[PDB]
Structure formats: structure tokens, C-alpha cells
Symmetry: C6
Subunit: 313 residues, 6 copies
């Protein structure tokens, strides 16, 4: 619908950071399932379960076929390779899906979807009411206008009693910021774990004839870039959601301060909201202060009284 109004900048940036994060997850994964192989060779001279590194030169002959080179490639890939190298692209796609859910859960949950759609529906009618132009400074619009005064007066009490919307948005960002804290905790802790050269000692002499091998994961660099890119993409994500958390904890959005628009418009009799109609009003003010300024007229009694006198006369 027209839900762009309810997405501040801190949820517009985040909506795109949660796409590029998806692009590397689906790119790293399709690359992984595509090849993600290991090239493993034996080491004739072994010491400490490691390669000892002990006319014209000739090649070395291990006497192995292509099929018992591939066996050891799999064994040394399943056992002696770290889980974070193999399953990383599938892991950051998971976390991406959480971030996409934790921002659209607000809209899809029906107890809050109705209230939001109720709020945007009256605002566009309030925004598109011709009569508000006369008051911010005929008869058909006046009856259309009083029709909107009443439902707004019912909307003023229908939604104001419930406080679910401010809590979801409060319990959506606060877990997103807890989520970003855990990603950076382990991801940086295991990013060093992946590397190109890996040794494996898998204990198969009955099949091949060698105990230790030396492997070479070629995608170790290309993943190390994406993880270093992913962490840097998430830190910018985390600071965004850390700011909106602070904003929701300092400004005290439960109660709205409507004394400024009444200061200059000479409408002393305008009520101040208590809870959960202030917030969504505090939110759309982030978009612009115009949609609330056009709304201050439908919520005053003398403005209704002036319409009533014009409607009486």
C-alpha cells in the first residue's frame, strides 16, 4: 500500500543493507555448492603429524588414481575443515531472513496491521480535505469534513487504549540490536579459522597408503573478503538500529508534544495524546512535519465549532 510513509530513513537504509547482505549470501552459496572443493596431496616424509619438508629434476610419484585422490579430498573436507568455511553463505542468509522478518512483522501482524492502515487512511483524507486549507490560514465538503471529524474522534479512542504498536517496534529493534551484537561476537572470532593451506591427518592407510596429506582450499580468500565485507556491512547496520533504539528511549514517544503547532495557529483547545497514537504520530513527523500540521485541525474542538457555525449558518 502507501506504507512508505511509516518507514523513516533508519528503516530505508536498513532495507537496502538487507539486500546486499542477501546478494553475497546467495552468491557465496551458489559458488559454494558449485565447486567448493579441496585439492589434497600426501606428504611422504611426515614429522609431528606434519609435512617434514625434507641430474635434472623429475616429478614425484605417489602411485594414486583419480578416485582415491577424490576420496581423501572429501574426508579431509568433511572432518579437518572448519564448519565456518563450508556453511558461511548459508549462515548469513539465515540472519538476513531474520532482519527482513523483524521489520515486516510490524506490518503483517493483524492486531497492528489494522491500526497502521487505519492511520494512513485518515491522514490522506485529512491531507486531501479541501476544507483544511481554509482553516490552516463549501457546504458539501463541510459535511464530508464533519464526517471525518467524527471517525477521527472515534479513532482517537479506538486506538489510544491499546499500546501494542509501540511495544512491537520497541521489541523489534531491541532484538535486532541484540542480534547484531551476537553476529559480531562469533563471526570475527572464526573468520581467521578459514585459510587456503590446511593440513589433514585422517587415518586412512588401508585405502591410500599415506597417513597425512596437505590440502588447498582455493576459495578461502574469496570468502575471507565477503566475511570482511559482511562484518563491515553489519556494523553500519548495527549503528543504524542502535540510533533508533536511543531515539525511542530519550524522546519519550508515548506522549506527543502538540503545543508548537497550536502556538502559532491560535487553537488553544487541542488535546495532547497519551499513548500509541502519539507514537505513530511521532513517526510520520519524521517523514515531514506537514502531515501532522494538517492533522491538528481535525482534532480541535473550536475548529469543529467554527465548521459547525459555518454549517449552522
Amino acid at each position: 500500500p502507501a506504507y512508505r510513509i511509516l518507514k523513516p530513513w533508519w528503516d530505508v537504509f536498513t532495507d537496502y543493507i538487507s539486500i546486499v547482505m542477501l546478494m553475497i549470501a546467495v552468491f557465496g552459496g551458489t559458488l559454494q555448492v558449485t565447486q567448493d572443493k579441496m585439492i589434497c596431496l600426501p606428504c611422504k616424509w611426515v614429522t609431528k603429524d606434519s609435512c617434514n619438508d625434507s641430474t635434472g629434476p623429475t616429478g614425484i610419484k605417489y602411485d594414486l588414481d583419480r578416485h582415491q585422490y577424490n576420496y581423501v579430498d572429501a574426508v579431509c573436507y568433511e572432518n579437518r575443515l572448519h564448519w565456518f568455511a563450508k556453511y558461511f553463505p548459508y549462515l548469513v542468509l539465515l540472519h538476513t531472513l531474520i532482519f527482513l522478518a523483524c521489520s515486516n512483522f510490524w506490518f503483517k501482524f493483524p492486531r497492528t496491521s489494522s491500526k497502521l492502515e487505519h492511520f494512513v487512511s485518515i491522514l490522506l483524507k485529512c491531507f486531501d480535505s479541501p476544507w483544511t486549507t481554509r482553516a490552516l490560514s463549501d457546504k458539501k465538503e463541510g459535511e464530508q469534513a464533519k464526517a471525518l471529524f467524527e471517525k477521527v474522534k472515534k479513532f482517537r479512542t479506538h486506538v489510544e487504549e491499546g499500546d501494542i504498536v509501540y511495544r512491537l517496534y520497541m521489541r523489534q529493534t531491541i532484538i535486532k540490536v541484540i542480534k547484531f551484537a551476537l553476529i559480531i561476537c562469533y563471526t570475527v572470532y572464526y573468520v581467521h579459522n578459514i585459510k587456503f593451506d590446511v593440513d589433514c591427518t585422517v587415518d586412512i592407510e588401508s585405502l591410500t597408503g599415506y597417513r597425512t596429506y596437505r590440502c588447498a582450499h582455493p576459495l578461502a580468500t574469496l570468502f575471507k573478503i565477503l566475511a570482511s565485507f559482511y562484518i563491515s556491512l553489519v556494523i553500519f547496520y548495527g549503528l543504524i538500529c542502535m540510533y533508533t533504539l536511543w531515539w525511542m528511549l530519550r524522546r519519550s514517544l508515548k506522549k506527543y508534544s502538540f503545543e508548537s503547532i497550536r502556538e502559532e495557529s491560535s487553537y488553544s483547545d487541542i488535546p495532547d495524546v497519551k499513548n500509541d497514537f502519539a507514537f505513530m504520530l511521532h513517526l510520520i513527523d519524521q517523514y515531514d512535519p506537514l502531515y501532522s500540521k494538517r492533522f491538528a485541525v481535525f482534532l480541535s474542538e473550536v475548529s469543529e465549532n467554527k465548521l459547525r457555525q459555518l454549517n449552522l449558518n
Copy 2:
């Protein structure tokens, strides 16, 4: 159409869990048909039809080509590998298609599609009727309004006699919950069956020269993750549909209790529904209690009588 109104939260969560379940089925399957191979080697020293595991080291020579390594890879894949490892991604896609059908069967079946579309069609007109604003607290809308009083009075009897809708939704969830009970029964029972190292004794010495071989299914881990993920995705699915089953068995949705909206609105003469018009009314109340509160006016006689006096005068 506008059928979002008829989907509670327990069918909104489930609509997305039935997509991620599809994503792993189509991902596990395209991965399966892609490679899903086995690397099988012989064992020179055999005991109990198993590998006995009995200067510088050299490779072992079995004297086999690439084509009779691939033959044994297929035989040991078709016979001595469990059916649940090969056909798992095709199996959870089947179950997914059932869950998608068992929730849209409600909408597509014509005996119930008409009634539902009949219910949403009058509600939006009831919701968008300007006259309801006057009554919840001119002449053209009154005739438009009485036009809606009559069809609602016919709708009150056209649908109320049949009880098919409440039974489909009752026979859709109750088999879905029976379905979730069987998935968890066998899936956990065979998830241990898949594993990386598998031995095979296939009885082909005329072709290769060896009796027993040792194989290595490399995707055994990656599938074990998805199955452990699938089971955990289904248990959250099952508890959802277990709750809506309880809800439909405790609240007694055949009869609706409309005595609350009349308590405060001063409309004593409002009838109570008997069957199959209560339910769909009990359902949209889950979305919000506003669409039914705006509907209580079109179903009362004095509200029609007050319109009639305004229409007479």
C-alpha cells in the same frame, strides 16, 4: 482479492513457514540431482564383510579404471544406501504441497468460495457506508443503505442454513495436525540413517575383482542439517495448527455472542446467529473487532426502523 481479512495470524505465520520449507526442498533437490554421488574404494583385507583395517610409504594399487570405479559407485548407491538420503528433498516438497493445498482448498472450492466472497463483499460496503457513522454514535445514502439492509437480511438466511465452511476449516486443520504428527514420527526415526561413511557388500567379483568396498557420501552432513532444520521448522508449524485446533474446540464458534456490542450501543433488538455465519464473523473479529461493530447496525431492526422514520420523514 481482499482475502487477507480471512487469514488470522496462525495462517499468516504458516503461510511463510510453508515457503522456507519449500526453499530447502527445492535447494536440497537441485543439489541432489546436480551431484549426489558416492566415492567408493575397495578393501583388500576383509573380515566379517567389513574392512579389516590390517622405506618411505607408497600408494596402494587396486588396478581399476575410471569406468569400473563408477559402476561400483552406482551399485553401492542404489542398493546399499538408504532411501531417505536420496529422496529426502523430493519428500519434503510433497508434504509442502499438501500444506499449501490444505489452506487454499478453503478458498478454491466453489461451494465455499461463493459464501466467503459474499461475506467480504457486504462487509466493505457496510464498512464504507457513510450512514453507519451516524448510527454508531442523507437521503441518497439512506436508499443505498436500505438496499443493503435487505440483501443482508437475505444473506442472513442464504448462508446461515448451510454449515460447509465451518466443517472444511475444521477438516483442514485437523488433518494438517494429523499430518504433522506423522512427519515427526518417521523423519526423526530415519534421520540417523544418513551418514558420511557407508560400507557396501554388493557381490560383484566377476567385474571388478573385489567383494566389499568402502564409500563416502559427502552430502550426508549438509542434508543432516536441513532435516534437523526441517524438523525444527515443522514443530513450530505444528504448534501453530495445534493452537487453532484448540481455539476451534473451546470457544464454540458455531454460535456467536453479540451481546457485548449491544450492551453499550443501546440496541436491544439484535439477533444472535446460529451457525456458519457466526464462524466467519468470529474469524474476522480476530483481524479486528471493528468490522463486526460496524456490522451490528445493519443487522438490527430498530436501526432499520430509525432509518425508516428518517426515510418516512
Copy 3:
């Protein structure tokens, strides 16, 4: 357009069974063209043109390269493999395309497309006529209403003379049911023909040096599942179209029985249809009995006469 009205449940189920049938045909085929290979080995000791099956063990050496292993793989695949294993996915896609054509041929053929679009066009206007509400129990709608009385009176004779629509729907299902009878005849007859282990005796000793070989079709199981799934998907298809055939042969849909709606509505002067306007009326009654009940008013003479008196007065 709005042709959902003209599709009963027995053509809604069938519309989806004809998609999953397509999914396995396109899945079996892309899988077939992808690999569909055979791994064929010789047999040194042959008896009856079959494999005779006659310190540490060593591999057997046939002295063949990769290119004369692939030659015999093709020869034993083209000749000594059954045609039903290779061309099955391309065969059930054909049959699927017939089933999709034999149900949309009704709509695309212009001699019948016009009549159907003529029928749905007046019904929605009959359904959306405000005047029908007064009669089922002002002046502008009355002229709009009489405008519809006349074209319906011309539609009553324009279409009633032709009988093409009832014959197409009669000649569409009756060949579909003849089609399902032939599919089950041969498909079950050749489903046993496909199997994993197949022997081939292709008579090429000048090239390889061996007369007989033993092959291994690995997809033999995976196709045997789809065919067993396809047959089970078609039997449910066939019973659907066997029921609608019986329905069209027992109820005698050429003549409609309109004596019920007139029994309670007190409209004795309502005509009974003869052919090809009864059927499409008998069909939409399957959707709901409401679209015909709202239609009984535009087809009566006294209802026109009562409008005429209201139009005269």
C-alpha cells in the same frame, strides 16, 4: 476474464493435477537430457549370451580406454534399452498438453467463446442490477432494467437455437476419459520394462574385443517412482472426468427445471428452456444457485409487466 464462474470443482481439481503432471514431465526431462547415461562393463566369461559369473585380491584388467567405454555405453543405450525408459518424460508432457488443450478448447473456439462471454456479461449485470432486490422480495434503473429485459429476450433466442456448446463439453470430456483409459493401458504395461541392471549383446568385437556387456542405468529407480506417481496422479484425474461424464448423462442437462425458484417466488409465468441455454445455466448453478435465482426475474413476463406498470405509473 471472469471465466472462474464457468469452471466447476471437477475442472478446478483437474486444472491443478494438470500442473503437477507437468512438473514431473519437465523435471524428468531436464534430468534426462542432463545425464541419462549408462555405465557398461564387459563380461569375460559369457554363457547363453549372459554373464557366466564364473594371495590378496586384485582388480580385473580389460585393457580399454575411456573412449571405447563410451562407445559401448551409447550402443547399449540406443539399442538394448527400452524406449519407455528414455522417452517417458517427453511422453507425459505430450499427454499433459492434450489435457490442457481439451479444457481450454471450449473457451478459445470462437463459435462458443462468444456465447459464453455473452452469458457471463448479462449475468453480472443481472447480478448487479439494483432493481432485482425489489423484485426478489427507481426510474433510471427501471429504464436500465427494461434495457436488459430486451437483450435477454434476444439472448433467449440468439443462443437457444444453437447446440454447439453442450456438444463440445460433451466431446471434450468423453475423449479425455477415452484418453485416460489408454494411458493406464500401456503405461502400467511397460513400467516394469525399466530397471537398473540391463544386459546388452550388441555384436561389436572388431572395435572393443568383447561380445557381451553388463550395464547399469542409475535413473531406473527415480523414473520408476515418477511413473508410479504419474499413474496414481492420473487415476485420480480419470475418476474426476468419469464423474462429470456421468453427471452429463444422468441429469439430462439439455432441459433445465426452473419450477423450484418459481414455486416460492410466486411467478407462475416463467418459461422453461429447451437447449444450450439450460446447460450453461445448469453449469453456473454448480457454482452457486444464487446467480440463477437472481436471473429468474429478468426472464418472467409479469416481472416485466410489474416494471411496466411502475414504468407507466
Copy 4:
């Protein structure tokens, strides 16, 4: 736009036959570029530049590597394989594109696109004119109606002078039928040319050491099916366009016979068309005879005169 009206059944069937023809061309081609390889082996004993076909058995050793097996595979594929086996899928896609162009050229050419769009535009207004209902058996529609009488009288002369439309449709089908005659001429003539077993004598002993080889094209069967399917798909195509050619040569569509609709409607003063407005009128009659019957009223003078008297009085 609404150009379904101008497509008879013989151009509705053909519109779908020209899609399945495309499906095999794009399927045969993607299959061709995918593999389309040849497996070629030498023949030690040669006679007439052909394979002479002259304890336990052992494999034959030619002493060749994988890279000089692939060279001969290409040489024997480029030279000693017929051009119709390699380039068939690219050839029937060409012919398909012609058939799609030779039926939409009618619509895209601007000298004829305007006339057709002019014809469908007045017909829907003639079809949707409320006044035609009164005449086939008020004041605003009468002026709307006379507004349409005049442009139709100008349309009667604007298009009738030119004859380009009847010639394009005459020069579109007559070359399509000439095209179908050539396809069947050569396609059947070379369909036998493709086959599985092909010999090649390419004269390269300096590189490999053998003069003659025996090859095996594995796709020879699968293409032989598609060509036998393509020819059978085109013969049904050709008979369609052979019928519409006969129809356009027997009925004499230059002049329309409008004496039937005037016979029963009692409108003696109705003119008969001469050229290129008869045809498009003769065409839409194929769809239904109703759009022309509703059109006979706007083209008569007394019908205009009766409107004029109702407009005068």
C-alpha cells in the same frame, strides 16, 4: 488491444501450432549446443574404405590418448556428418519466426494497422450504443448516436477506396502455403540422412595413424523423433492455411451480401459494400454474426431518418 475479434479459428489454432513448433526448435537447439558430440573409434582392418569386421578375450589397444580421440571426433563431425543433423533445430526456429511474422505483419504495418483499429473502434461503440436496442426490435444517446452515424458515413468512404488490407491477408496466406510446400519438400528428403552409425574417412594418418573410423551420433534418434513430429505438426498447419486460402477464393469476399439482415429487419434502404470494408466485415462475421447485425442499423438511411424524426420531435 482487442484484436482477438480479427483472428478466426484458422488463425487461433495456427497461433498455438507456431508455439509448440518453437518449443522443439529451442529444445533441440539448447540440446544441440549442450552436447551434440560424436564418439569415433578406428577400424584396424579396412576394406573398401569401410570396417572389414574381420584364452579369454581381451580389449583391443589402439594406443591413442584422449586428445587425439577428440580431434577425430571433431573432424568426422564437421566433414562426414550431414548438415541437416547439426543445424536442424536452428532451421525450424527460422521457419517459425517467418510464420509468426507473416501473421502479425498484417497488424504492425501502419497503412493497415490504422484501418483495423478504426474498424474495431466503431464496432464496440456500435455494439455498446444503447439506441441500437430500440432499432433492432433517449435524447442524449440520440445525439451520441447521430455523432456515430456521421463518422461511420465517413468511415464508409475513408476505407472503402483503398484495397490494401484484403491484399495483405491474401499475400500473407498465399506465401505461407507456398512456404509449407517447400518445408515438406526438403525436410522429408533429408530426414533419412541423419542416423546413429556413421562412418568417416577423413585422411589423417600423419596425426593419429589410422585412415578410417567408425562414429556414433547418439542424438540421431532423438532428432529423428522431433523431425517426424515437426513434419506432422506442419501438415496440420498447412491444411489450416490451405482451407483459409480456398475460403478467400470461393466466397468472393470483395463484395459483402447484406441482403439477409435486411430481409427480416424491414430495412430495404441499406447499401451493399464494394471492397475492403466488406472483407473486414466478412471476417468479424466469422467470430459471430451479431456484431454485423448490430451494425446494419448505423449504415441505413431510414434508421437515421427515424432517429432524425425522434430527434426532430
Copy 5:
């Protein structure tokens, strides 16, 4: 938008020739990046840096592995293969993108996009004005009509002063025709350069042991077809744009000749255009002469005067 009006036939054919040209570029390229390999063998006996071509036969043994067959395949592919064989599909895609840009640059450039959208906007209103029907042979349309007389009188001077549109279309085709002249110059000159059999003398004896090799580019034929098809597709393109160049150089489109429509309509006082409003008027006349004939009325003074007298009286 509705810019089909501004595309004559010589830009409708060209719009489709510039798609099939794209289809072979994207087909030749995806085929190229897919395989585009070379099979290269040595020649033991060399003369003039070329292959000298000097009981049962046996294969020749060069003693090379698969990895130093692939090295020479790349060296003889990068150096001793012509640049036109490798980069041809990427080259004709470039030229295609120019042709698509050189025909939509007219529409996207804002100095000319506005004028064109201004011209089509008034024409449809002129075409859809009911009053033009009376004049080509009431009060609300007259004021709507005079509203259009004035903006057309301002449009007559707003656009007529600038001449950018006629120069872009003049400088778009004249470079397209210069472009077609260069394509045919070099493409035919290098099409012979590609061929199947290519020799290479790359000077690597330290690695392989041979000086000269003989290679086999297998796609040389399939590209030779596309280039011969591309050249034949461009010559038909070039003659199209050579004709529209001549048309724009013979007819003198700067000044329009409006004396024909006034000859028969009896409107002597109609002005003749000078520049850049004649052209776009000369262009839409190519579509049909009807849109200009309906336009001659809004541009005459007595037609405005007759409206003025009807507006005065």
C-alpha cells in the same frame, strides 16, 4: 506512452531487425564463453613451419599428458587465432546497442521529448474532440474547443521557432547509415579469416618438445553461418535507413504543403507551417492522413470564427 504514432514502417521493421541481431549476439556469445575451445595436436615431421604430411596400423604416441595438451590449446588460441573469431559475438552486440540508442535518443533527450509529447497530447484531444465532426462536414464542447484553439495557437509558436527535432532525426539516420557502411566494410573483409583448420607455430619446445602444432576450431562453421546471416540482416537494415534518408532529402520536410486538405474543405484561410512543426506533422501523415485532416480545423481562423459565432449566438 502512445509513441507508436511517431514510428513509421521504416522504424518498425528496424525495431525488429535490431532484436534478431541481438539474439545471435547473445547466442553466439553464450556459446563462445561456454566452450570456444581448440583441439591442437603436434606434427612430428615439419617443413616450412608446416605439417609435412610424410603389419596392421597402430596409433601414434607423442608422450604428452592432458595438462600440456591444454597449455598449447590456450597458447595457439590466444596468439595464432584471429581476433574476429573470438570476439565476434561481443562485437555485433555492441553495434546492436548503438542502433537501439540511435533511435530512442530522439525520445529520451528532454529538449525533444517535451515537444513530441506536446504534439501527441494535443492530437488525441483534437482527434477526440466531438466538435471536429460538425466542422469536417454543443456549448460545453465549444468552450472545451476554444480552450484547445488557444493552446494550439501557442503550440503553433512555442515549437515552430526551434528546429532541434528535425536535426536529431536527420543526425540519427545519417550516422546510422554511415555506421552500416563501416560494418559491411570490415566484416566481409575478415569473415574469411575464421576457419576450422588452423596451424600454429608458437615456439615452445622447452615445455612440450614440439615446435609446430595443428589445431581445429570446431565452431568456425557455426560462426561463419551467423556472420553470413548477420551481414544479410544488416544489408536489409541499411537499405531501410538509406530510403528514409532519401525521403528526408527529397520531399523537403521543413515546410508542409497543407493546400490539399483546404482544397476540398473550403477553408481558404489556413496557414502553412515553416519549420519543425511541419516535420512531425509530415511524420504522423505517414501513419495515416486522418490525424492531420482532423487537425486542419483547429488551425484555421474562420473555423474559430464559426465557433465564435456559434459561441456568440
Copy 6:
């Protein structure tokens, strides 16, 4: 929305150059991940850690298998190949995403998205106001017109106080031009770094037996083309954004010069804008000077006064 109005030609060209730049990045990358391999051979005679290059000829035998040819291919690819050859396609996709963000950031940021949507919304109403036709040379449009005079008078002060829009467009191009300066700095500096023949000395004698190898990157040419194409594509990009930077620094767009439209229209009392409403007005003038000329009437006082007298009388 209708944001084509706010994109001059220097942001229309750039919108397409930023697509072809994307096409080579996604083409170079999918090509890279596809193969991007190296063919590496040893050198028996080494000097200076480089290949010394020291009857019938025979092949050279290094005694290496396929698996220790692939190991060295990876080691010599990860270490002794330049980072700019491997990661180039992923690098120019990054820079492309910046250029796409740095031009749509203007539109997506809500503090500026509202102002722009506010500006285009009144302009189309100003453009589509019928009354402007009378003034540039009835009663309902006059009230519709005065309704627009007031909001424009509020829009004249609502947006004029803020200066964010002119700074974003100033801080978007000035960093884009700083970005183009850095691309050309390093890209040309490392484009020579990629090449076909590369030597590697990786210090693995324990595994293979050779110290130095000679490799062959086959894609070195095809990337050198794209980079030379990318640099040439960016230089045309950079000059575009260098011109719009100069334009924004010479014309002094903070203040608009509205004295020309008033010179000829005889409206002396028209105000001159100060900041941030001049710019967006200076911008749409680039599209055409007509949208501002039609706007000069809604911003004058006597034009409102003349409407007021027509509204008073």
C-alpha cells in the same frame, strides 16, 4: 512516480552508462567464477628463478598426475597472480552500486523526497489548470484555482526556508566526481598488471619435485578488453558529472532570475525566489521552459487580484 521531470540529460545518459557498466561487471564475474583457471607447467632448466629455455622429436615427461597439476594451478593462482586480475569484475560492480546509490539517494531520503513530490504535485495541477490558459494570454475552476493559489503561497514558504535539497545534489555530484578521479587513478595503474604469461616460484619441491613453473592465464586478454572498455566508459561518465558540477557553480542556482517571463507577460509584481525553491525551479527549466512559464501566473499577486475581481464580479 513522475520523477522523469527531475532528471536532466546529464542524469539520463548517466542512468544508462551505469547499466552497461553493470553488464560487464556481472558478465566478467559470472565468467570468472565459471572457469578463471590457470594452466601451469614446470620448467626443468631454471635460471634466475626463470625458465632458462635451454631422431624425430618426442614429448617431454615430467611424471606428474592430474591432481598435482591442479594443486600447483591453485597455488600459482592464489599467490603469484595479481589481485586486480581475479577481483576486477567484483570491483567494478561495487563502484557501479555507488553510482546508482549516489543518484537515487536524492529521491529516497525522506527530508528531500517530500519536497520533491510536493513540487511535482503542484506543477501538474498548475500545468493542468484550465484557468492558466486565460491568464497566459469559469467559476468552479476559479475556486479550484484560488485553492491552488493558497497552497502555493504556503509552499512558497514551507520549502524556501530549508536548503537541504540543493546541498544533497551538490554533495552527490561532487563526491561522484571525486569517485571518478580515483577510479582512473588506480585502474589504469594496474591494468598492465594482468597478462597471459605469468611465471610463479612458489617453493613446493616436497610435493611435486619442481621449484619454478610457467603458467598461462587465458582470460587475461578478455579482461584487458573490458577494463579498457570500462575506463573508456567511465571517462565519458566523468565528463558528464564534471559539466553538471560546473553548471551548479557558475549559474548561481540559489537565486532564480524570473525577470524574463514577466518582461513579456506584463506582470511586474512577481517575486524572486531566494533559496531551494529556485533550484528545483532551475532544474525543471532544463526539461522545458514551459512548466515554469505556466507557473509564473500562480505566483503573482495581480493575477490573483484579477481572479479575485472575476471572483468578486
